[PDB]
Design a protein around this nucleic acid. Structure first.
Ligand SMILES: [Mg+2]
Lengths: 63, 611, 17
RNA sequence: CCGGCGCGCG
């Protein structure tokens, strides 16, 4: 058959962060791979952590 | 057991002008933000360094420095620039302005507490209406009642001419007044207990007698309920009209500054005069600053774009509560495309070298310094940046026993985030076990996952003892297993356990198989291509009858005259005797059923022996 | 979860001997 | 390091 190679590939999606720059107002880590930002733990992810009862994992990602 | 009591509370309350002053004490007087040339904070402006605190911690508006109280020339404190995030200011309004939330929102609290129709108060505050008899605790001598829309002809010329100017103005604001000042005077001299009693007696009178006969009752119940809450709290009903305007710290407003300018732009104009129109302009400036969009047409800027007020920035899906507080972006987190790893254990995942070295960077620094391979933190970080071959040994060492949290985007239930033991894999993709894909609702056609590292020992213990996949085999919804083989594994098992072809699918003609001592012999014969996966065979059984089969009597019993008889069932043969107690069992099966049974049995036995 | 329920005599007095 | 508009991925 005829198989194509698509733009969506690794080397453009792998991202990592230890620490770094934060927003000026919220003082939270930035948003975006290009800005070396962090991953967001939204409310639906907070619900899952509350479902497990992991109250200390949740406080780490909040403070 | 005595409960570990914890009594913590938070309360909101309407604030007082004295508390606003205590916040600011520090008044913003000029609308200047920065110098057009030097970009320095203008004195007495929205960003004044004396009012709010030192930019570039430990320096004054002049340029002096001290080691981290007040300067003499510019009077700037010697503290950290943290204070610019927390120190408030205030704007001394010449005239009191009502709070938009308590006048224009429906139902109006001010209107219900004063007991006048909302249109009347709106006309009094916005239009050129004057209210008669604003206060009661001071005597009057006139018979003007209500809010006369037209200006009183006598009160314009006659009385001021007869009563002159000074004393007239001294007693002016006691019979006729206008705007938010009249409302604040009415609120200040209210007797709440009299309000409660009058409301109760009017409610009883209405009851002792059918839409608005009820709606008036509900107003009376609402008003006495509203009146009661002021008595037991420390709130004052006149605080719903503002005498001072607190100012947000500059570092939280690096749009809002434009609205703060207009308040100063129109308040400083009003104090120059000291006229009715400018009083209204100050009030509208505060309304737009506090809450735009409630007054019908919301005030726009030069680009015909609606301004954004504090209410807009605290409410909505993108507001402070639902966007900044209920969800946060975190450090020590990564992301990459996920690929399938069928060789992984159920409690393991694969991490790329880059994501792992970023997430565990501080632990790699500690590992470097601990074994004397790095002199300090900077040298260790430089070594990490150079991708030295010893950085990866320390990373692989410190990743052992430290769990990570994986998470797919649409977290619909709690199994959308699970904990795994990371291992270093080549490439740039996250290696995921195939049996945990259903819990994540993940397939390998472009999906990505986020990784998180628990830092404290409590978080690591929580991740290891609560969130690992081997302790979460059941779904909380109904209790069904979540890590069940699917698709390819299910097809493999179905083919393995699909037995012999039988009947007309096995023989062309109407019929008018090897015997194995143990299952290992059958499997060995299968390996040597002696038999197929589904070819029938007889297996000697030396355990109890434990083969699932239809509860049926033997097809045929071969009874010998010596005593032995053979009972032939659909799936097994049983040899019994009357002289002896012997009992032999042979199971008719395939290599596939034997392989499935042996797989499960060996899994159980190996897990038992490993412990 | 894990946050529920708030988570010298006889010295200087020996026998002289 | 702030918001809008447009285009995409799962
Ligand atoms: Mg997919």
């Amino acid at each position: 058959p005829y198989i194509l190679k698509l733009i969506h590939q690794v080397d453009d999606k792998i991202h990592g962060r230890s620490s770094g720059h934060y927003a000026l107002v919220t003082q939270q880590p930035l948003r975006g791979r290009s800005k070396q930002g962090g991953q967001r733990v939204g409310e639906m992810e907070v619900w899952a952590l509350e479902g497990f009862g992991v109250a200390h994992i949740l406080q780490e990602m909040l403070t | 057991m005595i409960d570990r009591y914890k009594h913590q509370q938070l309360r909101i309350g309407l604030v007082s002008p004295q508390q606003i002053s205590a916040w600011a004490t520090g008044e913003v007087t000029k609308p200047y933000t920065f110098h057009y040339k030097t970009n320095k904070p203008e004195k007495d402006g929205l960003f004044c360094e004396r009012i709010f605190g030192p930019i570039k911690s430990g320096i004054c508006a002049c340029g002096n420095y001290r080691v981290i109280k007040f300067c003499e020339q510019c009077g700037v404190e010697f503290v950290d620039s943290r204070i610019r995030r927390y120190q408030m200011g205030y704007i001394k309004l010449t005239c009191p302005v009502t709070h938009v939330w308590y006048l224009k929102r429906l139902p109006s609290y001010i209107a219900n507490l004063l007991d006048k129709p909302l249109k009347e108060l709106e006309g009094l505050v916005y239009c050129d209406f004057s209210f008669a008899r604003p206060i009661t605790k001071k005597p009057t001598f006139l018979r003007l009642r209500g809010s006369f829309e037209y200006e009183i002809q006598s009160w314009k010329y006659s009385i001021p001419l007869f009563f002159t100017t000074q004393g007239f103005e001294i007693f002016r604001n006691r019979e006729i007044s206008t705007g938010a000042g009249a409302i604040r005077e009415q609120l200040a001299d209210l007797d709440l207990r009299i309000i409660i009693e009058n409301s109760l007696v009017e409610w009883k009178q209405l009851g002792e007698e059918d839409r608005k006969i009820v709606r008036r009752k509900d107003f009376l119940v609402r008003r006495m309920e509203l009146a009661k809450h002021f008595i037991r709290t420390n709130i004052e009903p006149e605080w719903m009209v503002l005498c001072l305007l607190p100012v947000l710290p500059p570092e939280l407003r690096p749009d809002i500054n434009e609205l703060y300018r207009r308040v100063i732009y129109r308040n400083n104009t009003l104090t120059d005069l000291l006229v009715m129109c400018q009083e209204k302009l100050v009030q509208e400036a505060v309304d737009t600053l506090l809450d735009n969009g409630i007054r019908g047409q919301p005030m726009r800027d030069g680009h015909n774009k609606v301004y954004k007020s504090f209410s807009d920035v605290i409410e909505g899906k993108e507001g402070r509560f639902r966007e900044t507080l209920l969800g946060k972006r975190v450090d020590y987190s990564g992301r990459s495309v996920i690929v399938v790893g069928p060789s992984l254990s159920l409690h393991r995942c694969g991490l790329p070298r880059e994501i792992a070295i970023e997430l565990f960077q501080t632990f790699v620094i500690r590992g470097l310094i601990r074994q004397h391979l790095a002199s300090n933190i900077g040298v260790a970080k430089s070594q990490i940046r150079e991708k030295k071959p010893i950085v990866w040994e320390i990373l692989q060492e410190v990743m052992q026993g430290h769990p990570v949290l994986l998470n797919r985007a649409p977290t619909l239930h709690r199994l959308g985030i699970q904990s795994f033991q990371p291992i270093l894999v080549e490439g740039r993709t996250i290696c995921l076990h195939p049996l945990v894909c259903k819990g994540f609702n993940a397939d390998f056609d472009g999906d990505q996952m986020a990784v998180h590292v628990p830092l404290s020992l409590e978080a690591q213990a929580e991740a290891r003892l609560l969130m690992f996949s081997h302790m979460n085999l059941l779904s909380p919804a109904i209790g069904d297993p979540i890590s069940v083989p699917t698709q390819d594994m299910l097809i493999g098992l179905y083919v393995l356990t699909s037995g012999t072809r039988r009947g007309i699918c096995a023989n062309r003609y109407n019929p008018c198989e090897p015997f194995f001592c143990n299952s290992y012999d059958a499997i060995g014969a299968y390996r040597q291509k002696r038999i197929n996966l589904d070819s029938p065979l007889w297996l000697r059984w030396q355990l109890d009858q434990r083969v699932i089969a239809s509860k049926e009597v033997p097809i045929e019993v071969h009874y010998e005259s010596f005593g032995n008889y053979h009972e032939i069932y659909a799936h097994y043969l049983i040899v019994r005797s009357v002289k002896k107690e012997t009992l032999y069992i042979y199971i008719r099966t395939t290599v596939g059923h034997i392989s499935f049974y042996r797989e499960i049995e060996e899994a159980i036995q190996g897990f038992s022996q490993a412990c | 979860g894990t946050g529920f329920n708030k988570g010298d005599i006889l010295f200087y007095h020996r026998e002289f001997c």
